[PDB]
Scaffold this active site. Structure first.
Site, mmCIF file in Angstrom:
data_model
loop_
_atom_site.group_PDB
_atom_site.id
_atom_site.type_symbol
_atom_site.label_atom_id
_atom_site.label_comp_id
_atom_site.label_asym_id
_atom_site.label_seq_id
_atom_site.Cartn_x
_atom_site.Cartn_y
_atom_site.Cartn_z
ATOM 1 C CB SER A 180 11.922 6.814 2.388
ATOM 2 O OG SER A 180 11.849 6.100 3.617
ATOM 3 N N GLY A 181 8.915 7.642 3.674
ATOM 4 C CA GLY A 181 8.238 8.279 4.777
ATOM 5 C C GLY A 181 7.119 9.185 4.299
ATOM 6 C CB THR A 185 3.001 1.894 3.955
ATOM 7 O OG1 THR A 185 4.008 1.371 3.090
ATOM 8 C CG2 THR A 185 2.407 0.839 4.902
ATOM 9 C CG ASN A 228 8.823 5.483 7.326
ATOM 10 O OD1 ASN A 228 8.326 5.517 8.480
ATOM 11 N ND2 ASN A 228 8.142 5.007 6.281
ATOM 12 C CB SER A 231 11.353 2.265 6.340
ATOM 13 O OG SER A 231 11.586 2.386 4.941
ATOM 14 C CB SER A 232 7.638 -0.464 3.023
ATOM 15 O OG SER A 232 6.367 -0.055 3.556
ATOM 16 N N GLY A 452 9.806 3.574 -1.149
ATOM 17 C CA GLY A 452 10.021 4.747 -1.958
ATOM 18 C C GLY A 452 11.466 5.204 -2.019
ATOM 19 C CD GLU A 454 15.942 3.488 1.004
ATOM 20 O OE1 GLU A 454 14.918 3.561 1.815
ATOM 21 O OE2 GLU A 454 16.729 2.564 1.103
HETATM 22 N N1 LIG Z 1 -2.516 9.857 6.663
HETATM 23 C C1 LIG Z 1 -1.663 9.722 7.678
HETATM 24 N N2 LIG Z 1 -2.131 9.826 8.953
HETATM 25 C C2 LIG Z 1 -1.291 9.693 10.026
HETATM 26 N N3 LIG Z 1 -0.012 9.429 10.007
HETATM 27 C C3 LIG Z 1 0.415 9.234 8.724
HETATM 28 C C4 LIG Z 1 -0.300 9.387 7.549
HETATM 29 N N4 LIG Z 1 0.478 9.147 6.426
HETATM 30 C C5 LIG Z 1 1.673 8.893 6.965
HETATM 31 N N5 LIG Z 1 1.700 8.984 8.318
HETATM 32 C C6 LIG Z 1 2.825 8.927 9.219
HETATM 33 O O1 LIG Z 1 3.996 8.912 8.473
HETATM 34 C C7 LIG Z 1 4.719 7.662 8.776
HETATM 35 C C8 LIG Z 1 5.370 7.175 7.484
HETATM 36 O O2 LIG Z 1 4.284 6.871 6.605
HETATM 37 P P1 LIG Z 1 4.421 5.615 5.607
HETATM 38 O O3 LIG Z 1 3.148 5.365 4.942
HETATM 39 O O4 LIG Z 1 4.891 4.418 6.399
HETATM 40 O O5 LIG Z 1 5.536 6.078 4.561
HETATM 41 P P2 LIG Z 1 6.060 5.362 3.190
HETATM 42 O O6 LIG Z 1 5.702 6.294 2.076
HETATM 43 O O7 LIG Z 1 7.517 5.257 3.409
HETATM 44 O O8 LIG Z 1 5.309 4.090 3.112
HETATM 45 C C9 LIG Z 1 3.647 6.692 9.276
HETATM 46 O O9 LIG Z 1 4.223 5.639 10.068
HETATM 47 C C10 LIG Z 1 2.807 7.684 10.097
HETATM 48 O O10 LIG Z 1 3.507 7.992 11.335
HETATM 49 O O1 VO4 Z 2 9.921 4.361 3.825
HETATM 50 V V1 VO4 Z 2 8.795 3.728 2.810
HETATM 51 O O2 VO4 Z 2 9.023 4.517 1.353
HETATM 52 O O3 VO4 Z 2 7.695 2.540 3.209
HETATM 53 O O4 VO4 Z 2 10.478 2.310 2.233
HETATM 54 MG MG LIG Z 3 5.903 1.986 3.213
#
Ligand SMILES: Nc1ncnc2c1ncn2[C@@H]1O[C@H](COP(=O)(O)OP(=O)(O)O)[C@@H](O)[C@H]1O
Ligand code: VO4
Ligand SMILES: [Mg+2]
Length: 730
Positions: A180-181, A185, A228, A231-232, A452, A454
């Site tokens: 997670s985070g 996404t 996060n 978080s999705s 992801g 967590e």
């Molecule tokens: N390539 C990136 N550029 C900028 N910020 C990013 C990037 N990847 C992740 N982040 C930051 O990390 C946070 C969590 O990323 P996210 O994709 O939502 O995580 P997860 O793996 O849980 O889906 C995003 O909301 C953003 O603030």
């Molecule tokens: O925090 V993420 O892995 O989108 O549920």
């Molecule tokens: Mg996500």
């Protein structure tokens, strides 16, 4: 050519900075170094030490402070020659070891280079800050370039998948992993952007809609968790579809496992789904009036975590974005309004306060919340009240009204909210998919963005399903990267000596979803349709089956309501509380009768459409959540197995959601558990490319003196092997 122009943004943001005179000097040094642990307790905290002497089996090195240490050559983690620092493909490294791999990622990260190849897959370290590498110009550069001609980028892995789709006329998948985070996404969104751009039919509607599906889903399916802020809380498999031509023909989203319980409960400091905050913030006073809304503090469903806002985020502003998206997707004004009424009704429902009445059965003293909800949903309040407190059930064949107490009535109101929400979600997705369905796809590139891995102080059934999914996705990587790979080699009798990579999530996977012997899910299912089962009987049963019998399971001595599962990412302790109810996912039928009678067109669909409202049956019972999901997941995996997969390993730098703060233990645990090094070793040691002799001859008999119409089949024999049906190459 920006690629060649050291003054380009490309060069500036995606390439390693030119090193200096001095650096040049260190780069040509004849000194040799090793990575070592100043503190052997902290095996992930390394220092660089100069190798000063050596014996046939050891190295003597100086430590930071200056002292000297000795190590078996065998256990030595040699530092690669500095010219390797910041290398684009870690498979080029001479020394493949933990600290070396981390080091290279550290070098790159320190200059905002978040993407790095690890052999055949991409590694993505979350920056936790914006990096201008996703502009149209950036996209334009990647366009059709070989992985090798351009720097590592999510766009590049996307292009390759796209080329492979067209070249091989095979479906592909982009599997983005991470805890997670980690950035799954964000990466997923980039993948879509790229595809839409490069295969978009230019002259952007379908494409913009495809794009626009995003903010709708996230407002309703994302929330702030302690790990996060975005978080999705559901997983998705996005199918980007293309015609014969290679143009984008459509798209389809398959959602998974929405965490419905978040609507009614959130741990301290977290948030409910963003949408609740967007509405309250972005709603008009006319809207706020008609919906009987106030601020989030006025609602039990939003006023318990202690958190109503996210730094850097404007709920009101996101609300406008959500709405425009609905607009672009096509939701009618009426539809949107019903959408908000549903959200608003959920909020009021949450405000209903059940009180003990006469005896045990509960009463509702103030009907404000109840009336407000009924009014927004277009249902009858007395009917709704009766359905909540005195729902009717069959006792054999007799019809009896129950008289629920305060606790059961609240749980039921909760169950009603969860179904309203989960079904609204499904409806939003279906609505989106119908807009996006317009072509019999020739191909697809499927992008997987799951919730992801967590771990929280309290891990429940939702966490188990999530972590189980992440464990399966990791197994899919293991399988692909190592199992299948080696089998080909062995198949093709290329004289491959089988290597055991030491990575295997099977035992954990089995512990959870095994049939016979029954795993955790099987037992939960059995207990779930057992009349006298309780959360206590359930846990006891798990223990009886796995305690001291299954290596990946642990019955803790410090608790009687939790059990531990050792996943690839770490052991997680699960709290059994509410598991049977959660697996059964009950909803009083009188509740559904109340809602089927709603004057709201949308509400009606949520309760009348079998696509949304119907529960599947497993013999004498309806299907449980576990079985159902286990099945969705198995089906997903089968689909993936029919594609050519591309992996993106997202890596979280620390656990604070901070930029510029790469934590070695944090990162190393992920590299270890993701199988990154092993994956590099395989890419190195083996033979990636392979072609059947005939398709090789047929294809090109031109470099030859050789007909077009095998054995016959200059170029150097170091980098090639002769298989039994195909020849292999590096
Ligand atoms: N390539 C990136 N550029 C900028 N910020 C990013 C990037 N990847 C992740 N982040 C930051 O990390 C946070 C969590 O990323 P996210 O994709 O939502 O995580 P997860 O793996 O849980 O889906 C995003 O909301 C953003 O603030
Ligand atoms: O925090 V993420 O892995 O989108 O549920
Ligand atoms: Mg996500």
């Amino acid at each position: 050519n920006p690629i060649h122009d050291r003054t380009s943004d490309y060069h500036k943001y995606l390439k390693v900075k030119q090193g200096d005179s001095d650096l040049f000097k260190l780069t040509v040094s004849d000194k040799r170094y090793i990575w070592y642990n100043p503190d052997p307790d902290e095996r992930d905290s390394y220092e660089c030490g100069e190798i000063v002497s050596e014996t046939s089996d050891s190295f003597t090195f100086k430590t930071v402070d200056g002292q000297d240490r000795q190590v078996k050559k065998d256990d030595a983690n040699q530092r690669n020659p500095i010219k390797f620092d910041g290398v684009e493909d870690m498979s080029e490294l001479s020394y493949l070891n933990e600290p070396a791999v981390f080091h290279n990622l550290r070098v790159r990260y320190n200059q905002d280079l978040i993407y790095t190849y690890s052999g055949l897959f991409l590694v993505a370290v979350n920056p936790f800050k914006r990096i201008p590498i996703y502009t149209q110009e950036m996209v334009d550069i990647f366009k059709g370039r070989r992985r090798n001609e351009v720097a590592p980028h999510i766009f590049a892995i996307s292009d390759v998948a796209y080329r492979s789709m067209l070249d091989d006329r095979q479906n592909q998948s982009l599997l983005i992993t991470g805890e997670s985070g980690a950035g799954k996404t964000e990466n997923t969104k980039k993948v879509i952007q790229y595809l839409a751009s490069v295969a978009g039919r230019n002259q952007g509607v379908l494409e913009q809609q495809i794009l626009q599906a995003n903010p709708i889903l996230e407002a309703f399916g994302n929330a702030k968790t302690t790990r996060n802020n975005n978080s999705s809380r559901f997983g998705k498999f996005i199918e980007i579809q293309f015609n014969n031509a290679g143009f984008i023909s459509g798209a389809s989203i398959q959602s998974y496992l929405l965490e419905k319980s978040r609507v009614v409960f959130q741990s301290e400091t977290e948030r409910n789904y963003h949408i609740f905050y967007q509405l309250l913030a972005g709603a008009t006073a006319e809207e706020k009036k008609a919906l009987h809304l106030a601020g989030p503090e006025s609602f039990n469903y939003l006023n318990q975590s202690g958190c109503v806002d996210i730094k850097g985020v404007s709920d009101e502003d996101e609300f406008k974005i959500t709405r425009q998206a609905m607009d672009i997707v096509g939701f009618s004004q009426e539809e949107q309004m019903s959408i908000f009424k549903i959200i608003a009704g959920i909020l009021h429902l949450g405000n209903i306060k059940f009180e003990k009445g006469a005896g045990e059965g509960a009463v509702l003293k103030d009907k404000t919340a109840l009336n407000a909800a009924s009014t927004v949903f277009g249902v009858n309040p007395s009917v709704l009240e009766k359905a909540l407190m005195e729902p009717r059930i069959l006792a054999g064949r007799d019809l009896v009204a129950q008289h629920l107490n305060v606790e059961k009535s609240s749980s039921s109101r909760d169950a009603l909210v969860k179904a309203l929400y989960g079904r609204l979600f499904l409806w939003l997705v279906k609505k989106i998919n119908n807009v996006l369905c317009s072509e019999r796809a020739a191909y697809f590139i499927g992008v997987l963005d799951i919730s992801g891995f967590e771990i929280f102080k309290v891990n429940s059934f939702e966490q188990l399903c999530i972590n189980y999914t992440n464990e399966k996705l990791q197994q899919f990587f293991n399988h692909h990267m190592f199992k299948v790979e080696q089998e080909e080699y062995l198949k093709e009798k290329i004289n491959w000596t089988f290597i055991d990579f030491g990575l295997d999530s099977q035992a954990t996977i089995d512990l959870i979803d095994g049939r016979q012997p029954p795993g955790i899910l099987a037992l939960l299912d059995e207990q779930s349709v057992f009349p006298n089962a309780t959360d206590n009987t359930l846990i006891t049963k798990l223990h009886s089956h796995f305690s001291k019998k299954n290596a990946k399971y642990e019955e803790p001595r410090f608790s009687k309501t939790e059990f531990g599962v050792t996943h690839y990412a770490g052991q997680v302790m699960y709290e059994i509380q509410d598991w049977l109810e959660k697996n059964k996912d009950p909803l009083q039928q009188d509740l559904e009768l109340c809602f089927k009678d709603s004057s709201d067109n949308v509400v009606t669909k949520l309760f009348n459409d079998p696509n949304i409202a119907s529960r599947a049956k497993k013999g004498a019972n309806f299907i449980t959540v576990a079985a159902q999901y286990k099945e969705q997941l198995a089906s997903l995996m089968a689909t993936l197995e029919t594609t050519n997969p591309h992996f993106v390993r997202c890596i979280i730098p620390n656990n604070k959601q901070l930029p510029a703060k790469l934590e070695d233990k944090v990162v190393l645990d992920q590299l270890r558990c993701n199988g990154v090094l092993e994956g590099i070793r395989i890419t190195r040691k083996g033979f990636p490319n392979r072609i059947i002799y005939a398709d090789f001859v047929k294809r090109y008999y031109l470099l030859a003196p050789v007909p077009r119409d095998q054995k016959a089949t200059n170029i150097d024999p170091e980098q090639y092997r002769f298989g039994i049906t195909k020849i292999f190459f590096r």
